[PDB]
Design a protein around this ligand. Structure first.
Ligand SMILES: OC[C@H]1O[C@H](O[C@@H]2[C@H](O)[C@@H](OC[C@H]3O[C@H](O)[C@@H](O)[C@@H](O)[C@@H]3O)O[C@H](CO)[C@H]2O)[C@@H](O)[C@@H](O)[C@@H]1O
Length: 362
């Protein structure tokens, strides 16, 4: 009764009608630049899963303009190399998807440049590995920057020419992530690592458990399996996803609705408004991998059911439509942060996360 393809296209059109800036080939310049890359990922993935190409022209426009040297980080020399390794990671993975959609080697080359760039801040001398997120300061090895990097080298191991060096890098990277301690006692991932003032050893800093730090790692473990056929990577990804699905861990509501930790206090900032959809998309990649690796028809049924349960809740309770005019005949759908709570406002990060859930069900 619910077409995930029709509703994704409607949410994409709502994203464009309210937040796309033709003058700047970017969505919402008042919102973080990296969230435009998350948005590009969702539009690229919609097209990759629905066989459609309606936004291909728009996507290429964004790519060409955001390719250029960033005004706030000229030293990066463009090609999405920014002042933060996670900012670069989001665009790099969007280019892996651009390559998956079009087959154009140009986008794969961007991802290779981005990996070499991010690897510049991998050090074995602190925490025994991992990279920093703050390229200027180098004081925080967190979860998202390392998850993004891990999925980049894992992705290149399946696509890039010198796959071997990327497979060795991805295997050594997952090993570091596993032993870092960021995966806690319930198989969830806190925000990052803290470092001992005296001993220099690193530990889980017990900062909040964000939804997207439970998703990007799933995509990485999926790609790590497609490059090794070692189902052990899938089982690790299933442990993380299963913990997100358990309501005892606080991320899944009693209704079965994914709930960001900030939604209760209504303090979800521009970053946190987009987290959920990144997880959903990555969970759909896990569910797809689990069902293909096993003959059981029920393989990945829980992950599919979860995405379906969350999509109907976001549709019924979180949706709003745009008012068409005699001048603007633009149509689509708008969405708020709470996939169960009421629609009050729509922001571009909230919109990108909604698109991600619909695309996760295509
Ligand atoms: O005491 C509160 C928490 O303190 C530690 O958490 C921090 C942060 O996790 C981490 O983020 C880097 C941080 O650097 C600046 O000093 C700070 O001003 C901020 O802008 C920036 O995000 O810094 C260190 C490294 O993890 C760490 O001290 C936890 O260890 C824990 O004690 C508490 O949860």
């Amino acid at each position: 009764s619910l077409n995930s393809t029709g509703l994704a296209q409607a949410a994409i059109n709502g994203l464009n009608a309210r937040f796309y800036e033709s003058s700047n080939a970017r969505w919402s310049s008042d919102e973080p630049w990296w969230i435009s890359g998350v948005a590009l990922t969702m539009v690229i993935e919609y097209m990759r899963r629905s066989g459609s190409k309606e936004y291909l022209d728009q996507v290429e426009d964004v790519i060409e303009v955001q390719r250029q040297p960033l005004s706030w980080w000229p030293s990066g020399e463009g090609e999405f190399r920014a002042d933060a390794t996670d900012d670069t990671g989001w665009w790099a993975l969007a280019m892996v998807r651009m390559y998956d959609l079009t087959g154009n080697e140009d986008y794969l080359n961007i991802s290779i440049k981005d990996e070499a760039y991010m690897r510049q801040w991998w050090t074995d001398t602190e925490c025994g590995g991992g990279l920093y997120v703050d390229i200027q300061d180098l004081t925080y090895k967190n979860a998202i920057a390392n998850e993004l990097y891990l999925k980049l080298v894992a992705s290149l191991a399946n696509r890039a020419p010198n796959a071997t060096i990327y497979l060795d890098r991805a295997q050594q990277a997952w090993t570091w992530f596993l032993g870092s301690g960021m995966i806690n006692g319930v198989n969830l991932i806190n925000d990052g690592l803290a470092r001992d003032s005296n001993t220099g050893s690193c530990y889980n800093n017990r900062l909040p458990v964000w939804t997207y730090n439970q998703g990007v790692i799933l995509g990485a473990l999926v790609e790590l399996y497609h490059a090794t056929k070692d189902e052990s990577y899938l089982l690790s990804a299933q442990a993380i996803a299963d913990a997100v699905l358990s309501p005892s861990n606080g991320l899944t509501s009693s209704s079965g609705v994914l709930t960001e930790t900030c939604e209760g206090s209504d303090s979800c900032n521009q970053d946190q408004q987009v987290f959920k959809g990144v997880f959903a998309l990555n969970l759909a990649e896990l569910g797809d991998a689990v069902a293909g690796a096993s003959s059981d028809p029920d393989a990945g049924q829980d992950y599919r059911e979860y995405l379906d349960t969350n999509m109907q809740s976001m549709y019924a309770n979180d949706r709003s439509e745009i008012v068409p005019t005699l001048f603007d005949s633009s149509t689509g759908d708008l969405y708020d942060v709470s996939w169960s709570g009421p629609f009050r406002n729509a922001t571009m990060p909230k919109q990108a996360s909604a698109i991600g859930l619909y695309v996760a069900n295509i």
